[model samples]
Target chain A: ETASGYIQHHLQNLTFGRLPNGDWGFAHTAEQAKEMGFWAFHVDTLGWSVLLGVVFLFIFRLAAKKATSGQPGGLQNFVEVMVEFVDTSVKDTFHGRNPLIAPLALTVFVWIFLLNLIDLVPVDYLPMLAAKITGDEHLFFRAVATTDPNATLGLSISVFALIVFYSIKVKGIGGFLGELTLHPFSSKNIVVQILLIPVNFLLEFVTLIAKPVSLALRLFGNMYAGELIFILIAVMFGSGMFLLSALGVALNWAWAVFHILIITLQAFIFMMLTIVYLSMAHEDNH
Target chain B: METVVGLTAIAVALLIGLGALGTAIGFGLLGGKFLEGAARQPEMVPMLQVKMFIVAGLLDAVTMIGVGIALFFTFANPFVGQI
Candidate 1:
């Protein structure tokens, strides 16, 4: 197949609902509307993050609300330990005292980690279930949202916006613009300043653009590669009969176990970099 | 075949690049604390060094394992043998 055909095939929605042409879509094919809906919302990604957030919040809230004066106990103690770890990291990086920094860090870490964790799921499991429900064996599901550059870039760009907003908020408009124009390399002479302003502005602009691109690409590249390997392995297994499929299943299990680390580590790195960027925004030149 | 090699290279890059990045930052955070503690106590440099090494080991353990596995995958992949 040509590149365009391949691209179109991958891009096609696995829908189950009524088509735009007013025809009821495939109920058994992977292209069914229901399957498309599941993939489009990134149900696994959103669902897992929300679930993890709620569970952790409730557990920690109860623990916090019930803590005694002297020391924390049980769940509270565990929550305190985790909170302190994050707090210390934030304190080191973010000198400006932002009350929201801790919560922001927690959210970034938890949400990204949850999203990345979806990569560790059997790439076929959720889609298989969706197919079973929709009764469409043709409808395929790809659940690794982080593997989608669009999603990762969107997240990173959102972080970039947050950083820019915080920078302006912490340092007023004048101070923020001044820092951009005069940071990292500065000039004392008026002539130099004139030459440097446009150059500095361009540099800063590139840095801003690079932030989301790098963030998105780094995550999407890793997860997509991992998912591709899983698919390739699946193809190898499904190529033959029972014996080959059994071998594929065994290898898939092993790879999934190893991939758990990759997924978790990538999430942690993305979260840490976000916190680091936000923290950097709080600083001024020495 | 070239595509497979390219994909493998990308995987290797991610494995090493991310592991290195995480290791460096993790150590930076833990080491900064160590330095701070040592500076404050002065006389406890020996004790601080010992503690720092302990934390250093913990921080680098997973990353080192990842690197080693990554290298193994690159040179003599078990998965490829199955194929």
Candidate 2:
């Protein structure tokens, strides 16, 4: 019971804003606090991802260096399968030449998958361990990175930047702007073109912006809701009522089982969207 | 009562949202392939459109089930009445 309390305490953020009554407010709504909290959480997630990548890369490099290609080992087989999957997806989507596409796809798949897989960890365990080490029960530590909109949005925005860069590279500045102004719906008449240019531009721009926002928010909302449900279940157990505690345990198990699909599906959706956007950048309007 | 309502809302939202997401992407991929094929062989446009619709129907099956379940949950929440 004390451990659970410590876990919850450490998970809570220390908000810096103040209320209107000249009094300081420490805890704000989760949505408001999430904007800042996401940065901290994702930085931790990126660290874990980079560590995993480096470890795998080292193993693969060592294996390659000591090569005997007759019978493949487990690590070699695993790395080969991953490489084939990523290589095939990149080849199909990225039609035009770009040096960074392969690395970007690799990073997206690995990072997002690692971040999403964090949900499988027992939520309270890590925070509790951190609290014990730091001797501050109120140390905030969020393990799941995709649950943070800031992190997901940051990734999506970076992808968006790449899309823009590729679009400009593939289609020159004039051609890129031309596609934006006259795409999806073309005007054959001069009067229609004159009248609809602003409207067409606004719609195109909004769609471009919405792509990243939707991608980021969809992943964040799903993961955040899953975490909140886990927290709520923990609170139920903490109430010390037998019936409520049993109910909470059952609900927690059920939700966690269902959430496994969600985590994987959301990660895949994000990856597919990244591929689609990059593919579109390589395409020209006919 | 409020807790039950909120949970139901969340469940319904998840049902529809997840399905919407899956179906949208599935169609996007299928449609892009269909368009590419049609463009390459304009004479096969009719056959490709028919094939595309079949794929689209398959793609939407799970989503349709999800929408039905979401509606059921919203109108007659099995969880609440059971509890």
Candidate 3:
């Protein structure tokens, strides 16, 4: 194959499914993955995200079990730091008195952080191992979950569900309808307000939809770019020259250092924005 | 096919290059503003830094979107598929 093929190979997911021809298997090619339709699954994305999620719970559970109020161990200290940080962030930004907000925020922050952290693993490591195991050179194993739009969008859609749920719960049907139809262009006159209803609904509806769209895109974009750059650097190892690969190593380290900030920042933004949006939903004052 | 591939390469370059240009300038202005705010209110630096990051996320959102699209062009080349 060529450089382009190498790049495309790295970008693909390990999609598994029943094909249109009635064959049940993993996709060996990009077009095959596409042909599998809605029933097909990106097994790597789902598996790694769920796996990392479980890792988060196990670590937290262990810390909670061993925690003593008198003195703390390393795991306890680490867990407490994360909890305290999320607590302060929620306290500062979230106005709602909901008991669920802090825990939700903590889970989102930690789980997403772990998801993004997998990007630090060398691009070719796990996938190459997986390829050998499967006896196929192109096994399409993408370990970093946040790089996938499906995974990121899955998260934001759940957040959107919460936003809608809380919006309706705090503000009854009339209030929610008023929220959608009343607004930035309100009027004292009933007729004028009625006229503004359509305009307000369109504008607010777009804004409402934009929240999740932008949130998902923001995280996906950051991680996808980060992973792509790593793959690009990994491509240099295939080159015949020694010095170019040396330069690749340097570039890899440099980008990985900067990417650390990007991954953490994106995870934090996702959590903070979720808190802010949920807080907005909790607000009853119109 | 060659012509399409060459042109797609140029298109990806423009998409990522311009996005990077805009994001760099945007962050410079944002960080400058944050520094000004923090200098005046030292006690508020933590709050201001956090606010700056929130704005930073919004500021980089479009450029990041461009980055993803550009990568898609690089890897898949949908236009080339049409050819």
Candidate 4:
């Protein structure tokens, strides 16, 4: 039961919601947290996501403050290179009149990358330290915000929102609806056009929705799998099985090494997809 | 009853399989046009790299879905306690 409890405990989120006492506070167990429902907050996921965003802002803000036309320092040079990197990629794909795409791409890449990076830290390090600091063993302190589907879905939904906004902006309301209702199945004949509207709407709407859902799920899945593997390894070590513990340690190192590629590539893919989706949003010819 | 590990094993294969396939297509597209275009016009390959990046995102659709679905399988796995 202890071993099973340990494994299950690692999977549960530290939530803040209504208590059995009929008051609002942190939930100490998964059982009681239900029926507080969607209003319940994953406190750790929210906290780490915001903290990492602030960290991303800090580095960029410093780079902007110290901008120079003369020889540049290492941090500034590094920031400039990344900025140009994302900006040029944006330039190629955006094909737009607005000025927002490049910076948004950069922000998405940096923030998600930083969030993924948190998974590399020993999983038990924070939860155990957090237990001591908070004086509760079930303090619920997951460091990787990306592993939380809530966080990843929120981001993807936000991107979807932007996609909707840009579609309306670029094509106008009439054009956007027309594209939705008309494209992929259109005809001059009234009967064909009428019949095709629902089919077209269903097809195109699914495609539109798929863009963001896929975007969110992809990043969330990769990050979550990696985190789960790490936690499982940690669980093996915790079980007091010496042979399995050694295997756990060895596998942990090997998985971490392979994950370096995945961690960075996931971030890049997210950014790339955003640019692609945005470009498709702004285009008249699909 | 279906076991949690069994579900996860199926999911991992779907993810890794789709990912490898998607990546194969992605890499193929990247070089598919290169030799012809580079031979035909020397200067445009550098220009085409961004286009490559843009299309790379589309090619990765399956892997991302497979990956995300795999996570959903893990998080939403109901078989864990019962099995």
Candidate 5:
């Protein structure tokens, strides 16, 4: 029978942080991790996230460059279908002149989807493997990257940066601020415009602010919930109770079947929102 | 003990109750739309149903995740465990 000591072992990222010896490296304790400030990075999250991102782009970049309207091979065909899907999605939702939108949409969808798809790997397997390799029980190696808020928030903030840039580029600063502060509270009268500033500002501020926050939190929250359920299922195996472990296996099987949809849908939802927001930024009206 | 226990029960209740409410409302709207389309054009039943199922897949996704999590809570409350 294993012990409850493994719970945090599984969840905590393999955090790189300052050690008590005045050296900075992978922190063995959660304590050192806390003291490392922002410098402490989750090596596993960084590695897997980047690795998957590179793979995602490598296939597309390779296939897309060699691709033509003539006969296509397997790689070309697969990427072409994906490109067509995202391109159609862009054409349907976004009407902008900038060429960046399609690629941004495609990258967000595929990269985030792949990151989330890591949860499909057996949850307990990573920690066990990590322990074997590191020879420390607490050397964390949770594989799913999108479950980390840092990753999701990083994505949304970057998307938000585009939204801000496009708004300024297409409409200029005055137009951007005017769109925000004016109608749905706009008025022809000077007194009305003056009075509505605070109200419009408050409403506009909430909408603009809430966009990235919700985008980040929604993906993070769903991905976290899914990962937590898998961990809880693993807990069944951890407690060494035969019935509990069996039940855990059963639960894991059922949830794993439904899990891929959540990851893809979350990625798709994020793409749609990003596209729409970017699209609306160029328009005269929201 | 009392507070945590009380909250646990509340969590379970909220899970099922909210899930049921959403599912019912969701199926109701989706079914209503599906039927609306069918009545407008009965010949479009196959296409409409296919479209509805796609809509339904997207619609049921989050709630299904919640339901799975809820089942996890009931069958094996992750919070309560032994070494």
Candidate 6:
């Protein structure tokens, strides 16, 4: 395969949608993926994210069922440490009194951590295995979920909706509207204040929207760059040069070792920002 | 086609290089302040660490967004298809 073709193959998702022939199927090429239109699904990303979520809940549920105050098993200890770490972070950062905040932070951290952990897997292994079983030479299967903007945006949009809901719940409609339209720019005179309403709304609305945009893009960027680096290293193996191949192996291990810190930090940042944004929404100060 | 591809490569290099330069400077400043504050108030290190991470996320946000755009150009090269 040409280097460009190989890179593109690794980048594509196993997109499933309606073809031009009025038939539903998986796209075999990038052009077909575009032809599938907006309704097409990145099946690999969706499936992997859902699978990791189920894995998270299953393990946590098992730990919950086997709880004991007298003594703890390895699973229980692992679960407890994770809970304590999340609980401490949430308590220190989140100032609001909502009952859901702690559990929400815990879920966000663990689920995202699990999703990002998939990056450490050799890039070609799963996709190659999937292709081997299906007998398709070019099955574009991406195992990492966060590398997909759609997956990251799905979580960020959900968080955004919660932010709006909490803002409205804590502050009545009038208060919410006032907060959006008043100060940042307010005047002593009624006419000046009225004139500033549009300006205030424009600024505040952009600020509000940037929250979700940044949240989604940050995670997507980090994971995508990491995946692209891994793909580049893999590309080195196909160059047919012994020196390059040896260098690729060294770089692969080094990048993976460094990537562990990145994956964890990104997960924690996402969780921390969600808690901080929600707490800001809960603040009713004038 | 040649000119477009050449320029795209240069553009991507600038995009990622500038982002990396800015983020490195920002993190250096942020880490300096964090360490100074920790040394001054050792009891508040836990709180400081959490606060520092919050700042670090914001500091790197723009660069991360730029990296995403750069990767899009690398893989897809929309400009190359234009002509």
Per-candidate interface DockQ score:
0.06, 0.06, 0.63, 0.22, 0.18, 0.52
Which residue pairs clash within candidate 4?
Answer: none
Q: Candidate order by lDDT, highest to lowest?
A: 6, 3, 4, 5, 2, 1
Identify the superior model by TM-score, candidate 2 or candidate 4: 4
| Cα lDDT computed for each candidate against the true fold | 0.67, 0.69, 0.86, 0.79, 0.77, 0.86
Q: Give per-residue CA lDDT, model 2, range A111-157, as digits (tens).
A: 67767777777777876786699787455666676665557767878
Chain A only: list TM-scores of all candidates.
0.76, 0.79, 0.95, 0.95, 0.92, 0.96
Better model by TM-score: candidate 4 vs candidate 6: 6
Candidate 4 or 5, higher lDDT?
Answer: 4
Tens digit per residue, CA lDDT, model 3, A27-103: 88888888787787889999998898898899899989766987899889988998999999899988667999999
Alpha-carbon shift of residue A120 in model 1 (angstroms) = 2.4
Quickly count the clashes in candidate 3.
0
Tens-digit lDDT string for candidate 6 (A61-124)? 9989979976888898999998998888888877667889889999999999999998899888
lDDT over C-alpha atoms for residue B52 of model 1: 67
Q: Which runs of model 4 end up more than 4 angstroms from their true locations? A: A20-23, A239-243, B1-83
Error of 4 at A80 (Å): 0.3
Ranking by TM-score: 3, 6, 5, 4, 2, 1
Residue A123 miss distance in model 5 (angstroms): 0.8
In the range A127-185, model 4's lDDT, one tens digit per residue, is: 89889987885676777888788988898999999999988987899999999999877
Error of 1 at A159 (Å): 1.0
In model 3, which residue pairs have backbone atoms overlapping below 3 Å? none
- What proportion of true contacts does candidate 5 retain? 0.03
Worst 10 residues of 3 chain A by lDDT: A277-286
